[PDB]
Amino acid sequence: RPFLCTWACGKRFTRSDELQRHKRTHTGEK
Numbered sequence: 001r002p003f004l005c006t007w008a009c010g011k012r013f014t015r016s017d018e019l020q021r022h023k024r025t026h027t028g029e030k
């Protein structure tokens with residue numbers, strides 16, 4: 001399964017850490 005964002009913002013990543021970093025733009029950092 002791909003690491004797809006579903007915020008809808010739906011960028012697909014091959015790396016979980018890259019999805020994590022991406023998600024940092026939604027939450028985790030303000």
Ligand SMILES: [Zn+2]
Nearest residue numbers: 005007009010
């Ligand atoms: Zn996103």
